[PDB]
Design a protein around this nucleic acid. Structure first.
Lengths: 48, 113, 96
DNA sequence: GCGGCTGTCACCTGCTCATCGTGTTGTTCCCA
DNA sequence: TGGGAACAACACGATGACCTAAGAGGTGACAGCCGC
């Protein structure tokens, strides 16, 4: 509540499955697959 | 104190309504639990479902809650008792719908063979 | 069927949520109702995954839509591989 | 960053039935 | 068809306030969370 009162209009927040729906809509998979391929190509131990 | 909260809520203060209902809801939950736990049937799985109704009742009683020196706790614990009684009314009437899939599927055959 | 009870729970909580939205109820009440609707659909799809199960007439758990597919008595392992059949009989066996 | 351990997800198995909180309205019955 | 009466619907919200008992499975496979 403090954050929303102080510096609102820059970030958007939510609770429950609405937040997940917004992320799954906005989030695109190509770039994520790219970084995952980068890290698996050069990874150590559990992280890979 | 609850008194100022109810005063601002009947006035129409949204923050006061929020803060007062945030206190009403735990009371409604506790009362619905301690009643419905000991009653027969599957009423125990409606405790929360009743609490929300109790809160809804309060949400529609504040606009005309003419105070008479009665604490708001009394108002909530009267509404909760009435809702519990209404659930009992709905339960005891014709308690024939038994949710047993071991008779409809295995024991009851199709009418057309 | 238990599915009727679970569908009734989800429809109850959905309608109560719609009412609460219409009245402009505070954040806490709408949040509680939305959480309850989430748990209701969760019980509809799988009663036992999270929390306590929703019991039916007795203390036994209710049957979820996914509980009707798995297990020994599920659809696959009781009705699609092994079926009761017509033109069949049985009796005790004696030596001729 | 990489271990323990610590839970959590899989499998294996099987006829009885207890009430409220008041008060009112409208239909739908029961008698005559 | 009159009164006399039974269920299904409703609208409110009786100066007082918290569960309940039941409850010994076993064995793998694993991915997290917590500790180094």
């Amino acid at each position: 509540r403090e954050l929303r009162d102080r510096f609102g209009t820059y970030f958007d927040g939510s609770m429950g499955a609405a937040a997940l729906q917004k992320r799954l809509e906005s989030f695109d998979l190509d770039e994520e697959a790219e970084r995952l391929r980068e890290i698996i190509r050069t990874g150590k131990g559990q992280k890979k | 104190t609850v008194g100022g909260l109810v005063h601002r809520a009947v006035d129409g203060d949204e923050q006061a309504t929020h803060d007062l209902l945030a206190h009403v809801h735990p009371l409604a939950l506790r009362y619905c639990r301690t009643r419905l736990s000991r009653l027969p049937g599957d009423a125990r799985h409606f405790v929360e479902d009743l609490a929300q109704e109790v809160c809804v009742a309060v949400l529609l009683a504040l606009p005309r809650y003419k105070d008479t020196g009665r604490p708001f706790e009394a108002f909530v614990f009267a509404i909760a008792a009435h809702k519990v009684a209404d659930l009992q009314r709905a339960a005891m009437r014709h308690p024939g719908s038994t949710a047993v899939p071991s008779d409809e599927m295995p024991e009851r055959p199709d009418d057309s063979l | 069927s238990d599915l009727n009870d679970l569908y009734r729970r989800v429809i109850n909580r959905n309608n109560r949520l719609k009412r609460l939205l219409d009245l402009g109820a505070p954040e806490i009440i709408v949040n509680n109702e939305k959480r309850m609707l989430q748990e209701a659909v969760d019980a509809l799809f799988d009663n036992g995954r999270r929390g306590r199960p929703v019991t039916g007439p007795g203390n036994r758990p209710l049957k979820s839509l996914s509980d009707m597919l798995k297990g020994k008595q599920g659809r696959f392992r009781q009705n699609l591989l092994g079926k009761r059949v017509d033109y069949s009989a049985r009796s005790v066996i004696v030596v001729g």
